[PDB]
Design an enzyme around this catalytic site. Sequence first.
Site, mmCIF file in Angstrom:
data_model
loop_
_atom_site.group_PDB
_atom_site.id
_atom_site.type_symbol
_atom_site.label_atom_id
_atom_site.label_comp_id
_atom_site.label_asym_id
_atom_site.label_seq_id
_atom_site.Cartn_x
_atom_site.Cartn_y
_atom_site.Cartn_z
ATOM 1 N N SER A 1 0.880 -1.056 0.082
ATOM 2 C CA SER A 1 0.249 -0.428 0.524
ATOM 3 C C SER A 1 0.264 0.958 -0.034
ATOM 4 O O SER A 1 0.058 2.090 -0.160
ATOM 5 C CB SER A 1 -1.542 0.019 0.867
ATOM 6 O OG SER A 1 -1.961 -1.141 0.950
ATOM 7 N N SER B 1 -6.594 2.946 3.779
ATOM 8 C CA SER B 1 -5.588 1.855 2.058
ATOM 9 C C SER B 1 -6.961 1.208 1.706
ATOM 10 O O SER B 1 -6.646 -0.437 1.833
ATOM 11 C CB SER B 1 -4.382 0.955 3.282
ATOM 12 O OG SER B 1 -3.337 1.841 3.510
ATOM 13 N N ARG C 1 5.234 -1.405 12.919
ATOM 14 C CA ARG C 1 5.400 -0.098 12.481
ATOM 15 C C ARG C 1 5.360 1.491 12.560
ATOM 16 O O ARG C 1 7.141 1.861 12.277
ATOM 17 C CB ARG C 1 4.913 -0.058 10.286
ATOM 18 C CG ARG C 1 4.369 -1.481 10.064
ATOM 19 C CD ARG C 1 3.154 -1.495 9.082
ATOM 20 N NE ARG C 1 2.039 -1.299 9.923
ATOM 21 C CZ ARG C 1 1.169 -1.060 8.784
ATOM 22 N NH1 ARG C 1 1.037 -1.379 7.477
ATOM 23 N NH2 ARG C 1 -0.287 -1.354 9.472
#
Lengths: 241, 240
Positions: free
Chosen positions: B46, B94, B225
């Site tokens: 993405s 996304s 992340r």
Amino acid sequence: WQENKSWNAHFTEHKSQGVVVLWNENKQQGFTNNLKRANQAFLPASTFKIPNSLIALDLGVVKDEHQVFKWDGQTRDIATWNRDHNLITAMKYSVVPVYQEFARQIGEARMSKMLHAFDYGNEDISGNVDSFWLDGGIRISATEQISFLRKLYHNKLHVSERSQRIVKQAMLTEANGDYIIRAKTGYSTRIEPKIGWWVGWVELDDNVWFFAMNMDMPTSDGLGLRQAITKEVLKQEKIIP
Amino acid sequence: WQENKSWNAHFTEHKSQGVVVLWNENKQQGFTNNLKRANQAFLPASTFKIPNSLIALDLGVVKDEHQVFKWDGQTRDIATWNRDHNLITAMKYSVVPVYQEFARQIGEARMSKMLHAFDYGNEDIGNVDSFWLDGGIRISATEQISFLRKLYHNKLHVSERSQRIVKQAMLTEANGDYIIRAKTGYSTRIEPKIGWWVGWVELDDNVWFFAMNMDMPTSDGLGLRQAITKEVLKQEKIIP
């Protein structure tokens, strides 16, 4: 429009007096704690950096949000002003001397035309062009602030789309996964009654809520309360968590 | 480029493996905990919504950030996908099926031409609505930084307008201390399953580009992340 006096709890709780005005863009409905004060026009003070930015950009006095405006070398009260700035920081830190220079370059004639074009407040620029928004004839109310901002949001003002995008960028104040705030603070001190402003909008996934508040601000101690009271109102109305 | 392996403590914390790459714009200097992985290429997944957005905008496939892309009525796995979207929320969530349609509306000729103009990774598109998820297209973290740097400076071969609108759509987080514009990715269709976070942190005086990826053997670690990236950012005193 709806008047909701329960919002006075959030004012009184912060030892304060003022107005917040909300506009629900999807439902086309407005809410305020004080209908009279919502329509009371005051000096825009640094809330004027919104129209000022648009005009400077559009007329090319400001190339873009990266152009550096060097410090004039005069030490002032607010340490944060005593340095070089671009558009983003000058708005963030409400850097008056930077904007006075913009007004000086724009000039009385081009400034007047632009403000008539914007339908902005009383479109009065009496005084010098370099400080009329602090101590000249220009007056704008909360509801007029909202009308102008809805036009900005929708790229509807008669300046270029680019100028509009750039100012909306410079307006970014706060964002997370729940909302985005684009806004501008103001503090009018040169004419009574001294008042703070916070105007802009809160962008949500499927709606936009416009706001404009002002409050009596007899001392610079109470400046943080502009956002705090606004947020308490936004929480009460379930716009933000 | 400087290697700083002390950043591994932030990965170690969570029995995670991966790379953070930083670029100091004022200094024209980069830093990373793993020079090797910094230069390994992976499917963008993405994170490719950034260039897909630029391409859709410049070609008029997307009018503006307000245009609604109605939900197709087919329910999908991720609850936030099952509703109407604009460019802002399709990016934020996304929303793959929105962006697949963009790519079908762009077409392989104009996508491939755009990616070469962009110098975007290996530029490897009959794979049109899916190449960024299971096709031959690969990009390393260092290449992500180079691409992002052109976008930041409106240096890409699309309109200034299109670059500005995508940068708006990238907005993730903002404070009185910083602004983060960024894009997540999660690549599960080809091994090794990995997570990405790429973008930049805007300060008063400087801009810090970042690109991180990490092994993502299960979806339970997707929070890592952003979390590990911020630990590195705080270590470098970039954010308080």
